[PDB]
Design an enzyme around this catalytic site. Structure first.
Site, PDB file in Angstrom:
ATOM      1  N   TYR A  67       6.608  27.816  37.247  1.00 54.15           N
ATOM      2  CA  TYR A  67       7.298  29.103  37.353  1.00 54.15           C
ATOM      3  C   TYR A  67       6.382  30.174  37.919  1.00 54.15           C
ATOM      4  O   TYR A  67       5.163  30.083  37.827  1.00 54.15           O
ATOM      5  CB  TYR A  67       7.764  29.629  35.980  1.00 54.15           C
ATOM      6  CG  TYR A  67       8.740  28.773  35.192  1.00 54.15           C
ATOM      7  CD1 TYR A  67       8.292  27.727  34.386  1.00 54.15           C
ATOM      8  CD2 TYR A  67      10.110  29.025  35.234  1.00 54.15           C
ATOM      9  CE1 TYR A  67       9.183  26.953  33.644  1.00 54.15           C
ATOM     10  CE2 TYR A  67      11.012  28.252  34.494  1.00 54.15           C
ATOM     11  CZ  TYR A  67      10.543  27.222  33.703  1.00 54.15           C
ATOM     12  OH  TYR A  67      11.432  26.463  32.975  1.00 54.15           O
ATOM     13  N   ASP A  81      12.897  40.066  27.764  1.00 56.33           N
ATOM     14  CA  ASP A  81      13.109  40.152  29.206  1.00 56.33           C
ATOM     15  C   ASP A  81      13.918  41.412  29.507  1.00 56.33           C
ATOM     16  O   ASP A  81      14.573  41.946  28.628  1.00 56.33           O
ATOM     17  CB  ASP A  81      13.807  38.885  29.754  1.00 56.33           C
ATOM     18  CG  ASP A  81      15.150  38.599  29.095  1.00 56.33           C
ATOM     19  OD1 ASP A  81      15.975  39.531  28.974  1.00 56.33           O
ATOM     20  OD2 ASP A  81      15.387  37.428  28.718  1.00 56.33           O
TER      21      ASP A  81
END
Ligand SMILES: [Mg+2]
Length: 308
Positions: A67, A81
């Protein structure tokens, strides 16, 4: 009927199930599946199984994932997030050397827990702390592996980098943990899964914007899946009995590829068709010994037959 793996690209926004539904909608087939979910706010590679190809998704979920993330220092949301409700915003003023030191400090393995942290009493820090210590029973920590971290870039309060991690690892959690190391929390603001095993995002396809022919014509047939893993080929003649039950014996083999005991190997025929996946009952180097002796015992034990 095509059988195989499809390298799909999930845009930021929709869920992984949405991708499976789209593929399912356009292919009009009988079976579609996925392996290794991707959060709605992230984008990237998502492995899609089609028909018999779904039977080998477990192997893809075992592969490593890479990632590219971007986290905001001094910001803490509910979900860890940006799509999460801002629950706290501290102050960060650490040096680039303090940051880098913190980042590369996670390479190895460390038992992490799912993204929690609330704004309520006895649920913010303290709770996170206890969970992390493996003290909370409803939040069991998991042992993960951070293989390597590179391409770090510190631009103000926002920092980005790439990580190669073992499956089952939350990237949101890794940021937060790094954020607490620095002492000011951190939140994931951007996340892109660049690769799953050898399958890359550059290679991926956006099923949402793809025409049925495109999608179909883009599936990797079983014969090309699981590229790694030893391959042994059996005499053509043994194709039928293998497709049914029947384990594989010494005299049935024609070509090795080298393998250990419990290892799993791909069983091809002379025509190039993938007949099945089996586990080695013997070594491989020991085969010459089974020969040289009129002993022709079982060498591979059937695991999955692809009666296509
Ligand atoms: Mg599902």
């Amino acid at each position: 009927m095509k059988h195989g793996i499809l390298v799909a690209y999930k845009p930021k926004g929709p869920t992984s199930h949405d991708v499976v539904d789209e593929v399912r909608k356009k292919l009009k087939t009988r079976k579609v599946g996925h392996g290794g979910t991707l959060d709605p706010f992230a984008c990237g590679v998502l492995i899609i199984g089609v028909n018999q190809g779904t039977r080998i998704l477990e192997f893809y979920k075992d592969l490593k994932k890479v990632y590219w993330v971007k986290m905001r220092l001094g910001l803490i949301t509910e979900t860890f997030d940006i799509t999460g409700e801002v629950v706290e915003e501290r102050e960060c003023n650490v040096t680039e050397e303090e940051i880098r030191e913190a980042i590369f400090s996670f390479v190895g393995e460390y038992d992490q827990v799912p993204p929690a942290y609330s704004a309520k009493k006895y649920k913010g820090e303290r709770l996170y702390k206890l969970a992390r210590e493996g003290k909370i029973i409803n939040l069991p920590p998991k042992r993960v592996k951070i293989f390597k971290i590179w391409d770090v870039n510190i631009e103000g309060r926002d920092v980005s980098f790439r990580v190669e991690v073992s499956p089952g690892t939350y990237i949101r959690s890794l940021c937060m943990d790094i954020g607490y190391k620095l002492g000011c929390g951190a939140t994931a603001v951007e996340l892109v899964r660049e690769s799953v095993g050898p399958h890359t995002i550059e290679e991926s396809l956006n099923v949402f914007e793809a025409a049925p022919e495109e999608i179909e014509n883009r599936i990797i047939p079983l014969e090309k899946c699981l590229e790694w893993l030893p391959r042994v080929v059996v005499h053509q003649e043994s194709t039928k009995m293998i497709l049914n039950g029947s384990q594989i014996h010494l005299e049935m083999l024609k070509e090795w590829d080298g393998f250990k005991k419990g290892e799993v190997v791909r069983v091809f025929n002379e025509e190039g068709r993938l007949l099945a996946l089996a586990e080695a009952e013997r070594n491989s180097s020991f085969l010459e010994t089974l020969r040289k002796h009129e002993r022709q015992r079982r060498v591979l034990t059937l695991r999955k037959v692809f009666q296509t």
